[PDB]
């Protein structure tokens, strides 16, 4: 039994990588800079 193996499963739901998450990072969110 291999360690790194696509055992098609859902940890609810981390296997599903998603882009389009980059838009809130640039135009939505504020950072502590600019205690």
């Amino acid at each position: 039994k291999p360690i790194i193996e696509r055992q098609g499963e859902t940890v609810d739901g981390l296997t599903i990588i998603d882009t389009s998450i980059v838009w809130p990072i640039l135009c939505q969110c504020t950072y502590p800079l600019v205690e």
Binding site: Q7, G8, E9, T10
Partner: protein, 49 residues
């Protein structure tokens, strides 16, 4: 029932292999099991296929 199991049939790569084994399944009919063990030793007169 436990031969398409092990968990992880909730994977959308299995869906095809899912039904292939399912449509190849039989039920544990008490008499049907005994007929397989008995046919192994019993002499025949008709050439079954």
């Amino acid at each position: 029932k436990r031969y398409f199991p092990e968990n992880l049939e909730q994977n959308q790569s299995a869906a095809r292999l899912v039904s292939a084994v399912k449509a190849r399944a039989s039920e544990a009919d008490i008499s049907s099991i005994h007929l397989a063990i008995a046919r192994e030793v019993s002499p025949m007169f008709n050439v079954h296929e």
